[PDB]
Amino acid sequence: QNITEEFYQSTCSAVSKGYLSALRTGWYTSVITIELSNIKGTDAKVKLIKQELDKYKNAVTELQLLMQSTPATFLGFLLGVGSAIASGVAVCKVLHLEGEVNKIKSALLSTNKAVVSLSNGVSVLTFKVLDLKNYIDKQLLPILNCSISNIETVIEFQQKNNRLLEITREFSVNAGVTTPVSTYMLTNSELLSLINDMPITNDQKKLMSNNVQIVRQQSYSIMCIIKEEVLAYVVQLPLYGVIDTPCWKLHTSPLCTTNTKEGSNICLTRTDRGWYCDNAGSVSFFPQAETCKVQSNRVFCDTMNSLTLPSEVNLCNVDIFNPKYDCRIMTLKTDVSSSVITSLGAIVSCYGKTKCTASNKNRGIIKTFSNGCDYVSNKGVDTVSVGNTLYYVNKQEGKSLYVKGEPIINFYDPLVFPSDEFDASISQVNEKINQSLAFI
Amino acid sequence: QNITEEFYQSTCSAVSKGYLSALRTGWYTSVITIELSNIKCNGTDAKVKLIKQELDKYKNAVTELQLLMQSTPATNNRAFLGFLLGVGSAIASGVAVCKVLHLEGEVNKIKSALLSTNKAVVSLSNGVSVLTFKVLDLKNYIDKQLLPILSCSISNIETVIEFQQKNNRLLEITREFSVNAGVTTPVSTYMLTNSELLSLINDMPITNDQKKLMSNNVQIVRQQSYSIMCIIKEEVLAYVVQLPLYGVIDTPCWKLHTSPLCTTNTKEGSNICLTRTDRGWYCDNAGSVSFFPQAETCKVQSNRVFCDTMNSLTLPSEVNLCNVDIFNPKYDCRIMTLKTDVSSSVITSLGAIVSCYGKTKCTASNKNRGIIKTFSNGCDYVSNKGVDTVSVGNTLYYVNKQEGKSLYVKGEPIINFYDPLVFPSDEFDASISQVNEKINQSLAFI
Amino acid sequence: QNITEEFYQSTCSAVSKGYLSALRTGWYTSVITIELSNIDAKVKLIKQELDKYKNAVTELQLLMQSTPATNNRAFLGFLLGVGSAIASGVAVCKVLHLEGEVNKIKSALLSTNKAVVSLSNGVSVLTFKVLDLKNYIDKQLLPILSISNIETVIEFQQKNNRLLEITREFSVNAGVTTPVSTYMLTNSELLSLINDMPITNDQKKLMSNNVQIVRQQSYSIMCIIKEEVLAYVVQLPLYGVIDTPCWKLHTSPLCTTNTKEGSNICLTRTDRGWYCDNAGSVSFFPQAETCKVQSNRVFCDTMNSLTLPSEVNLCNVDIFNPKYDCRIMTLKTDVSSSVITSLGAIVSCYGKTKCTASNKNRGIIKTFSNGCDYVSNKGVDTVSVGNTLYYVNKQEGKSLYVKGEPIINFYDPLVFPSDEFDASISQVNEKINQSLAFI
Numbered sequence A: 001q002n003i004t005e006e007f008y009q010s011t012c013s014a015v016s017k018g019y020l021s022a023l024r025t026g027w028y029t030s031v032i033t034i035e036l037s038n039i040k041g042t043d044a045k046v047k048l049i050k051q052e053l054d055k056y057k058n059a060v061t062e063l064q065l066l067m068q069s070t071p072a073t074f075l076g077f078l079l080g081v082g083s084a085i086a087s088g089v090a091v092c093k094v095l096h097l098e099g100e101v102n103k104i105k106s107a108l109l110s111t112n113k114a115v116v117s118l119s120n121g122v123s124v125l126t127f128k129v130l131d132l133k134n135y136i137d138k139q140l141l142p143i144l145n146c147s148i149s150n151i152e153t154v155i156e157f158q159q160k161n162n163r164l165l166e167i168t169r170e171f172s173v174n175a176g177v178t179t180p181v182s183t184y185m186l187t188n189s190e191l192l193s194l195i196n197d198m199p200i201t202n203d204q205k206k207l208m209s210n211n212v213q214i215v216r217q218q219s220y221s222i223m224c225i226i227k228e229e230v231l232a233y234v235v236q237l238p239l240y241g242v243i244d245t246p247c248w249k250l251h252t253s254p255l256c257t258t259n260t261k262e263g264s265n266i267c268l269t270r271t272d273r274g275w276y277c278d279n280a281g282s283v284s285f286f287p288q289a290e291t292c293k294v295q296s297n298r299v300f301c302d303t304m305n306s307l308t309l310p311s312e313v314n315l316c317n318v319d320i321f322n323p324k325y326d327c328r329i330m331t332l333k334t335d336v337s338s339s340v341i342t343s344l345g346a347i348v349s350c351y352g353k354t355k356c357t358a359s360n361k362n363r364g365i366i367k368t369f370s371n372g373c374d375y376v377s378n379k380g381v382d383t384v385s386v387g388n389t390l391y392y393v394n395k396q397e398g399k400s401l402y403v404k405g406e407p408i409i410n411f412y413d414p415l416v417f418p419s420d421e422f423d424a425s426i427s428q429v430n431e432k433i434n435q436s437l438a439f440i
Numbered sequence B: 001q002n003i004t005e006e007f008y009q010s011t012c013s014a015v016s017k018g019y020l021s022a023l024r025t026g027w028y029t030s031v032i033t034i035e036l037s038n039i040k041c042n043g044t045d046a047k048v049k050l051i052k053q054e055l056d057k058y059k060n061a062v063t064e065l066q067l068l069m070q071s072t073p074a075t076n077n078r079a080f081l082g083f084l085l086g087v088g089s090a091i092a093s094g095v096a097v098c099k100v101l102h103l104e105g106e107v108n109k110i111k112s113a114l115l116s117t118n119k120a121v122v123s124l125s126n127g128v129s130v131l132t133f134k135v136l137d138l139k140n141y142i143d144k145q146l147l148p149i150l151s152c153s154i155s156n157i158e159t160v161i162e163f164q165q166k167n168n169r170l171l172e173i174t175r176e177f178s179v180n181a182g183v184t185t186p187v188s189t190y191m192l193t194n195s196e197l198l199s200l201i202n203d204m205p206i207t208n209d210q211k212k213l214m215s216n217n218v219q220i221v222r223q224q225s226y227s228i229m230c231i232i233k234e235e236v237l238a239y240v241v242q243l244p245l246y247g248v249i250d251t252p253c254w255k256l257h258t259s260p261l262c263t264t265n266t267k268e269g270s271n272i273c274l275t276r277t278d279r280g281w282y283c284d285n286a287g288s289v290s291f292f293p294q295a296e297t298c299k300v301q302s303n304r305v306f307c308d309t310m311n312s313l314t315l316p317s318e319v320n321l322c323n324v325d326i327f328n329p330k331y332d333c334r335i336m337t338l339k340t341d342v343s344s345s346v347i348t349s350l351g352a353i354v355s356c357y358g359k360t361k362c363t364a365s366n367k368n369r370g371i372i373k374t375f376s377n378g379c380d381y382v383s384n385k386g387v388d389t390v391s392v393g394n395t396l397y398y399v400n401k402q403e404g405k406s407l408y409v410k411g412e413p414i415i416n417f418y419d420p421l422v423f424p425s426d427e428f429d430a431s432i433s434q435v436n437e438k439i440n441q442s443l444a445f446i
Numbered sequence C: 001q002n003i004t005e006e007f008y009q010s011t012c013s014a015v016s017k018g019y020l021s022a023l024r025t026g027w028y029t030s031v032i033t034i035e036l037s038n039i040d041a042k043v044k045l046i047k048q049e050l051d052k053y054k055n056a057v058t059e060l061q062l063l064m065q066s067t068p069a070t071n072n073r074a075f076l077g078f079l080l081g082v083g084s085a086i087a088s089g090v091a092v093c094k095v096l097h098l099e100g101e102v103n104k105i106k107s108a109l110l111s112t113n114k115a116v117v118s119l120s121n122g123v124s125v126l127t128f129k130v131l132d133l134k135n136y137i138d139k140q141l142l143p144i145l146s147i148s149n150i151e152t153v154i155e156f157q158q159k160n161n162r163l164l165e166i167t168r169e170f171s172v173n174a175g176v177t178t179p180v181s182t183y184m185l186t187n188s189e190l191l192s193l194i195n196d197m198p199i200t201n202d203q204k205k206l207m208s209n210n211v212q213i214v215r216q217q218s219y220s221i222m223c224i225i226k227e228e229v230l231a232y233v234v235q236l237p238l239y240g241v242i243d244t245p246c247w248k249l250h251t252s253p254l255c256t257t258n259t260k261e262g263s264n265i266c267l268t269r270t271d272r273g274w275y276c277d278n279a280g281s282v283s284f285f286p287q288a289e290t291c292k293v294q295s296n297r298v299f300c301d302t303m304n305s306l307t308l309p310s311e312v313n314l315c316n317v318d319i320f321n322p323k324y325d326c327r328i329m330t331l332k333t334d335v336s337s338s339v340i341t342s343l344g345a346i347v348s349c350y351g352k353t354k355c356t357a358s359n360k361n362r363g364i365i366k367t368f369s370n371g372c373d374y375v376s377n378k379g380v381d382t383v384s385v386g387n388t389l390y391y392v393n394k395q396e397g398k399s400l401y402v403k404g405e406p407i408i409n410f411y412d413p414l415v416f417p418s419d420e421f422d423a424s425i426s427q428v429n430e431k432i433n434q435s436l437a438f439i
């Protein structure tokens, strides 16, 4: 779409706008099931099937060993704390009630996909993706009560047993909870049909179908129960209750004075960088922008990694001194040079004797940054160098706008400025400055 | 057991108690071995063609493990309170065994003891009595079933399929070591199968309590174990499986949940906050308390907690008084004073702490009935009894449906005891006494 | 090599020197290709195994639907910059979507498996054909469309395995994997990829002798499925800085040891990590876990570094020097800990903690008193601090103990600014002159 950026010279920050939201807000719990079999002149083929049957016994013995265990799994320190799989573990706990697997075992008699009402009222979508009991009771039990010369029986059993062996492996090195959800746990044809039957909007169906590889990354596979010849595990799928609302990304870098004595210098950095998305009259703020996933101009975030802020937080980009929101800063003296590759350019904080440049593949250096905080758009720029570090800029097409302004750090007297404030605000600094002045 | 929770309204914190400890204090290093075959025909059919392809994989796997072993095993070393932790190598005990196996005649000592059996106890030259395992004998299979066929031909397809099955474990063990620089964790079923691990545990020189504990929680043992690629020499592939030893068992553990405690005045610039910074796992250990500040390093199975003491701080047992009397003179309880006047929730073991500030909508809902509690400004708590979800702003939290009793300890929020005009806001890691000292200075200035 | 250590008693820090640098400064992008085919009981196995190939290709098309995506940001690790590691390899992915660009590779990989192709953007890439499924399916599986030659089923199973496995790795990694697996690039393919690479023989010898490190620092980016070609990019590191001196700085908290633990003040150097000489400056790596050590060589990615003046080294010799403002923090961290260094251990013992250094067979050989001290690994096997047991490195090297007055003793506890998350020697002196002027 129309991706645009604004660099604010006054605050050493940039906003990339034009994105669309797809926020994980809820969970959908489904029960995936695998129908198991309960079973007990020696040539080579009977030996091979006993070897392949030993694996089936080993995997079943191991999954019972996992089922022994009740399932367990800048401003980010302000976030809350919650259990990601608490919604799926509660469903798993229900499946441990007597007759509850028997309800699923019974409802999955005439079909593979079914909606089952549990004792707690959760309407779950149950799946039978593999029937090993049918294969063992039809093709392998009569041939063992000890001679077969159809080698295709060995390969067919190897192929049919393979998915079970691998699902068991994934659960073994992951304490019974896996993420992302592999194609062994749930193939694409199973996932796409699971989406079509999901109690979601047609917009959410189209969104999840065109972005299945994100659904996998945001989903959990929880090993649940082995009981009554049934292997059941829970797949916890994302619900995107917020879709196509505006998102924007805020990039910040340190803003420092460039005086000759580096000990008479003070710094200032906006701490509110991350993803911002309009959401229900407020703004969902994602302080660790690494937890969000971007597909073109769509951004996938999980609300568990967010803060719900007033919409007035956006005024901090236009007027960081506005009275409506107390914009958050830090005053640690971070007089080292760095760069931040934005959506359509690069913020460069250049301090000291550092060589900071932006170059082109064939043309050469096209901008040399002086001390302070500056910005260059990706137009004609291929890389950015800061000291010995080379950064590649994004070659995405979009318009950058440079908002000239006086660096706000110049408005402060270094002799009273409270350096080393890990997390403060415009008002806390002003409060601390007025106190230190009254002592004079 | 009986897991219980206490919410302390005065400090906006909760303690989940009733747990039993299983803290890693030692290591057991075992040597896993695979006896290799030393191998060096034009006229072929299709079955020998498949065996030639599968034999190229065996050669490539051996060639790669030799390339990986070229590098002495390597680790990535350092130099809420996690920056306070120490720095040590987790696999240092297993690397010492690898160093011994590179001594001349040391691999041959293992080769001899695993000649007539698959499991054996070997005393190394450094005095370590290791439990050695021969989990795969490709030398016997290749020299008996594949060497005579090597101008050459066979039409027995069952040898091709059996060879693919026997060679697979080597190929998968090799893959895991290649994408993990020779050190893997957790230990996979290829590195050590479930039946081999259970028998390895049964022969281990430990008490029956630890045997029953490790046996009933093998999938935890895997995650807390390391597989260290060691040596290929004299037709032997050897790697070390480093297993945890739980020297602290069945001592009391409890989890501390904290959330910001702020004043709820109308003007958001007159509001001050306070948060207990000591959250994490606490376990009684040897007259002290092992404190695990990164509560992600501990793994909980029902009412048992598995932690690694390498990720702990050793505190006096008086640190527990901070939950009863945060102003006690015996321990200086640690708080922070950053003005964190945003709403958030903390999902505990048996409930939810809700810090609601400003204009944020904080509610607690039921499975199907909907909102059953609306939180007002301040710090409150709801039990998981009858509650399924918690909403704070646009964030929906699911509570844990574990069964246990919650106890609400009513008390005056201690943030109300401070004058906002002298309160030292923005203290990243301070204590009750450090704050009190800073207030007397700003008051003595009047 | 000759690893040496110095412990500075005055600042509770130790420097391990003698290492050699190998710093990632550039990237080599190569295009790996897989030529695809467009399409009783024994055919049942062939139909099932053929469905896997169709589904795997169907999935890669579903994965390729998404231009590769990254998780970018917006002790001092928060001071680092922000950049995309795979941006150079993503540029190749963008080129391969241009018309006629795949056919250029398809043409160059007609008579051989390895070829150098000049792309439309001017990048001379080394292209590889590691699997030809088009040949197998159009020659052995198209004519059967029954056959009861079971060796055809197994041969297809063996040839299809790598494709299915490459698809799996991309599915649980959003199309970008690291390290690069043997499926993405086998060891013989990587060794030959290095040998045909336009680099010096020294870097070839370096990369060849440390391939499992090259894998960890390399990325595999899924690119395109088009015109019967599956193409992905393997992004390999180039080490532009080699054999310059590196050293590691270990720090631990330095506190006073008075009787009342509330009259005690602490001080910790925050500049711990890896330091390597680089282009007249010093590349500083604050999270030393991002570096990988092989014997005495240090492999780091400059994307995780800060470029500091070379005078930063004076902080180890004279922390009060005027040339560099040495960085400290003053949080009251009066808990005991140990730091295992290259040749010894730093021990910060405070309060009532039992801190000892023991031998395997001899027992306790040193008991640490309150404060910050050091023991060399010579004759020492373990260190105990409270309930935590640390193993020392048994590496051979000499440690040098630099005796000095702990600098925390130079401060008046009544004016010392405790709770400074990241300050410096001069910032602390500045705050004390102010707090004294108020008296």
Ligand SMILES: *[C@@H]1O[C@H](CO[C@@H]2O[C@@H](C)[C@@H](O)[C@@H](O)[C@@H]2O)[C@@H](O[C@@H]2O[C@H](CO)[C@@H](O)[C@H](O)[C@H]2NC(C)=O)[C@H](O)[C@H]1NC(C)=O
Pocket: C410, C411, C412, C413, C415, C429, C430, C432, C433, C436
């Ligand atoms: C500004 O303050 C510094 C630091 O003084 C410190 O705080 C004092 C209250 C006391 O605790 C000192 O021990 C601390 O050093 C002054 O530098 C000190 O100067 C005195 C001179 O007698 C010397 O003994 C100290 O060692 C110095 N401090 C250090 C860390 O070396 C400085 O003189 C003050 N004034 C100015 C203008 O900088």
